[PDB]
Every structure is written in C-alpha cells, then in structure tokens.
Amino acid sequence: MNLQEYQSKKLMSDNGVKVQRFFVADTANEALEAAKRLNAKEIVLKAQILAGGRGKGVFSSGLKGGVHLTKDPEVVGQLAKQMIGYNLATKQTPKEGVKVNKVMVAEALDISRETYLAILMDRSCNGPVLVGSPQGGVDIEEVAASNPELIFKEQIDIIEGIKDSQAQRMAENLGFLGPLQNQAADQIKKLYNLFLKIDATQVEVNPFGETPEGQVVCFDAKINFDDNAEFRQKDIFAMDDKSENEPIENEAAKYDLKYIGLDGNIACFVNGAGLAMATCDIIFLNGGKPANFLDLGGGVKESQVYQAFKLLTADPKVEAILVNIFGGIVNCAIIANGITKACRELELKVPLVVRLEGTNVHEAQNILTNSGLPITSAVDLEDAAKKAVASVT
C-alpha cells in the first residue's frame, strides 16, 4: 500500500523526521491561500499522485512538471489550476498517467548536497538494510549502474536494531561532514525506527539533503506499506484513499478478488496467483492482449464467480473471457455451476472460453456441455490460449 506524499510526510514528522513545512489543498485557491499562510522565501507546488518522477512529467492541461518552485503565491495558484483535475504522466505512470485531485504547497529550502538514503527488507540478507549513496536527486537504479562503489549498504540485525556504529558510518558514507554528520545519523536512526513501527517494506528519501543553513532534511519520501500488516496499522491504512485505483479493481476488492487491469481485450480470471500470471503470459505469446489478470484467491463460491464475471464484462474493452481454473480443493463442478449460473443471469455477449482441470473434471464438463450455452471448452492452457485469441479477430 502507498499513501500520498503529504500523508507520508506527516507520519515521518509525527515520528521525529525533519520534513518541510507544508499544507495540503484540493483547489487552485486553497493552494494560493496555502502559499500565503506558509510565508517563506520560496514555495513548492507538488501534485499528489502515488507515482514518481512527477517533477519531470506532464499534465494533460499542458503543464510540464509536477514539482514547481516559485516565490510568488499568485503563481502557486496559477500553476495549481493546471494540476487540479488533470492527468499527470510521469515516466512511471501509464500513458495518461494519473488524475491529480490534491496538491501539496510546502516551504522550499535550499539544497547544498543531495543524497539517496533508504531502508527496506532486503531479499538477500533476509533482514532490514540501509542503502545510501552520496549522489542524490537521481533515480537509484541509475546511480547503481553508472557507479556501484557509490552505493553503501549495511545489514541491520532485526533484533539488535540499528546501531550508532552503523548509523554514523552511513552518515560518513553519505558525505555529511563533521557537525552535520551526527545529525544525519540521528535522522537515519529515526527512519529505521519509523520504518519498523509502521510495518513498511520500504521508506525511500530522495533527496535526503543538506541545506545552506546546515539542516538535514528529507525533501521527498516514498513509503511502501506491507499489506499483510493492515490488521495492526489500522490508522495508517485508513488514510489510503483508494482514489488513484483503476475504477474497476476497487469493485473486485469488495468481494476479495485480486484484480489487476492491463491494457487488452481478452479478459481472463483464474484461481491461484501463478496461473493468473501464467495465463496472461500464454495469451501474449499467442498474439493475445491480456485485458487483465484476476485471482479468485483461495477457494471460490458462485458469488465470486458471478461477481468476477460482472466486473470483467462491465468493461467495454473486453472482447472475450478466458476462464482458466484448476479444480483442487473446490472441485470443478462447483466452479462450473457458478459459471453457467452467471452466463444466464448476466446475459453476457462476449465469446467465453473455459479451461477446467483437476478434481471432478469429467462431471463439470457436462455441467457446461449441458447448459447449451456458447461456452467454448479448451483441452489445456495452450488450447484455451490460442482459441481465446481468434475469438477477437
């Protein structure tokens, strides 16, 4: 899960992390007034979308850039009016990026040195890790490629927690000289602890900087939250608005359906995660255009089936559905019913292809065969794949 920047910032603030003063607003005028209340040398306008690279993106309104520096509050409002409502397309969003409904108006600061610092559960040390680079402002992947030695890591023992030894040593590595050096250290200890507190899989600050005034500041942040931790981060998950989600998916989650909309015509719902990915795969390989990926989670239930069939069809971009389910726990029969029972109550008008296998095979093939419905039966996933494709030519 991901929260907006102003949400992340408050959280980091509430936990002793030096962020920049800011106010949130959802209109061009609030933005203006917000620039006034701040009252500072320079202001910073930042569209609030979960994506990154905003400061290099482009709004649909024609505006270029998601982060704008200006000393004049009236400009803040003029720029805002170009952010509020439009679509921002950063190098990390789709083609039409995301629609912005809120903007952050914060106090700019001067940046002497820019450094990249981040904490994450590393799938190599199977533990928390500190990842710093004295070269900030840039996308990390890059710096890595371009100059590996410029990267510094430090495995933190999840039971001992971070140690000055580590913190200070990282601070040194980041470039923070003498006096400042210990400030960056304290801050890094802050991030780690905040990181653990909020069950975050990662907290990324870029730049983790230094001002001329000699202040260590997290000028930007990106926190990814471990979804499996919602049950003990109730307050943090309440802030997840679910506004930037593709219209559809929201619906699916209402019936606990793992939906992930792609850009295709051949919708398809499968049970089990891997088969879900596998089906998109085998579809694309055969010139297909997976319209999505759906996962009926653990077990199924005529409810889900129908529901799953309703979301998929409500989408006018679909020209076929590829059902691929492996009857393990719940036999294929109970699945077949949910399918046929839905085709009728849904009066679907898209060529449907179904591929069943496992417990109760033969029986469920009759449940379908019988219904007299236009259900195309495939022999395996290859079969289902290729056929599901022609059905949209």
Partner: protein, 305 residues
C-alpha cells in the same frame, strides 16, 4: 546449522504429523482429508483442550506436549495471519523437525524475525509461509494440495505457485512420469526454504531423476538457484532440469496475487530469470502448458525413458 535441516523436507510414510489450529475451520477441513489421503495425522493443538478429541484424534495444549506424546516429526499450520508467526516459533521452540506454514498474510517483518530465529538453529526446517505445502505421492501429504492428482514417480518439483504446481503435476502423470517429491516453497518474499534447499535434496536423491523448477517475477531466488545448478548440476551424471517462470508480461510495481510477485526498482523481472537458468543448462519451457512434454523429451534425449 539450518542447512542441516534440509533433510527434514523429505517427508514419507513414516512421518507422523500434528496440526496447529487443529479445531479451526481450516485445520479441521484439511485434517479430515489429510487422513483420507493416508497421512499419519496423530493429533493437533488448541489452547485449553488438552486431553479432548477432534476427528477421533487427541488435542493437546502445546506443540511441546503433542510432540513428546505422539512423537510427531512434523507440524502443519493453518492459523489466521495475526497468529501464524507465533505458531511457527512455537514449533521451533518445541523443535519439530518439520514445520509447514500455509497461512497467507503474515506481516513480512514478522517473517524476517522468524528467519532470524530460524537460521541460528538446525532442529526445525520451515516451509512457507503462504504455500501449498509438501507432498510425497503415496506416502505423505502435508498441506492443501489435491493429493489424488499426484502419483509417485521420478520428477522432483519445487515451486513458488501452487496452481502452477498442480498444472505441472497433472502434466507429468499424463505423460506417465510421476513425481518423487513436491515442495511448494511459497509466494512470500521471506520464507524458510528456497529453490536451492530443494535442488540440494533433489540432486542427491536417487529417486529423483529429473527436476521441474517453477518460479515467477520478484526477488532473486531463481537466480541463486541457476547459480547453484551451474555449480552442482553440471557434469556427466547431471540430472535434467525443466522450468517455467511466471510473469513474463507483468506490469512493474504491481503485487501479483503473491506478496512476493512484484518487479520493483528494476529487480524481479522474469527474463533475467530465464536467461540465468538457461545459462545453467536448465531447459526452459516457454509455455506453462509444455512442462510435461518438455521434461518428457529431456528424459527421452537421454534414453532415461
């Protein structure tokens, strides 16, 4: 130390198994069936019912007791997410040679702490969390997989997806090849057993003549594995290995049904995984539907049929 516990991954007819969260909806359901398959389920657990009975079986208070009273060499966990973590350490404390956590949804941080405890000991070997479990066609079944589709045989299977394993199991029985041991390592980013823990076993198990590896986007478990194969499965007496990685078409930054299936910050993509495994002489199927025939051909190319 912990690598010494790989040995425990090979359950068999001798494996006596207990269930944690025994009287729960899941524990109960998969236990009635764990029986019907032929698994030696000797009892289960739940706080405050020590002495009682469930499914005609005993219900102890502690994993500790249950083991010392049934001699169970294994334990399975179906418990809800907020308690699966505790459930594992409890098995670890009671030193149960084998622990299989099925539960999906355990906070990652919790798993990191478990891995910490875990790696500094060799009595307990963990499978999971968020996995189907493990099965020795005919002799033992710990988990939630459809036992009947399996048939004792030669192919050794290790995978990060359950449904994708079933696909594989189905395919190697159609071709009449059968499975030696199937280990579903999980869909989470931090678990107690990886591809190499199993490749290690397969390679030294005479019963396993071939191996099917099933991975997907996310992490680098597939990569470390491809490395290992190059080092340990090269030579004349090398066993054939067929694989299929899932997610060649997944959009970045998205969690694909599996907390661990996600390409992030440039890492996790499927193509590297296929390029790496191939470098280690792994024969990769480009279709999840060709797992069966592919490995069938490999055994063929070596008159191993």
């Amino acid at each position: 130390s912990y690598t010494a516990s790989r040995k425990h991954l090979y359950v068999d007819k001798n494996t006596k198994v207990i269930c944690q969260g025994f009287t729960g909806k899941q524990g109960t359901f998969h236990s009635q069936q764990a029986l019907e398959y032929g698994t030696n389920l000797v009892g289960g657990t739940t706080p405050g019912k020590g002495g009682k009975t469930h499914l005609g079986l005993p219900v102890f208070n502690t994993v500790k007791e249950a083991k010392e009273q049934t001699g169970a060499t294994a334990s399975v966990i179906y418990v809800p997410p907020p308690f699966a973590a505790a459930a594992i350490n409890e098995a670890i404390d009671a030193e149960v040679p084998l622990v299989v956590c099925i539960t999906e949804g355990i906070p990652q941080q919790d798993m990191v702490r478990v891995k910490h405890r875990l790696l500094r000991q060799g009595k307990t070997r963990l499978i999971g969390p968020n996995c189907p479990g493990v099965i020795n066609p005919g002799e033992c079944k710990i988990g939630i997989m459809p036992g009947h589709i399996h048939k004792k045989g030669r192919i050794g299977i290790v995978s990060r997806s359950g449904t994708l394993t079933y696909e594989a199991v189905h395919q190697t029985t159609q071709v009449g090849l059968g499975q030696s041991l199937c280990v579903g390592i999980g869909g989470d980013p931090f678990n107690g057993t990886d591809f190499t823990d199993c490749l290690e076993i397969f390679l030294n198990d005479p019963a396993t003549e071939g191996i099917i590896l099933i991975g997907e986007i996310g992490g680098n478990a597939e990569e470390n594995a491809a490395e290992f194969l190059k080092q340990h499965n090269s030579g004349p007496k090398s066993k054939p290995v067929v694989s299929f990685i899932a997610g060649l078409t997944a959009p970045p930054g998205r969690r694909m049904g599996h907390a661990g299936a996600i390409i992030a910050g440039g890492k996790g993509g499927a193509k590297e995984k296929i390029t790496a495994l191939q470098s280690a002489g792994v024969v990769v199927s480009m279709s999840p539907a060709q797992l069966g025939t592919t490995i069938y051909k490999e055994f063929e190319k070596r008159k191993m049929l």
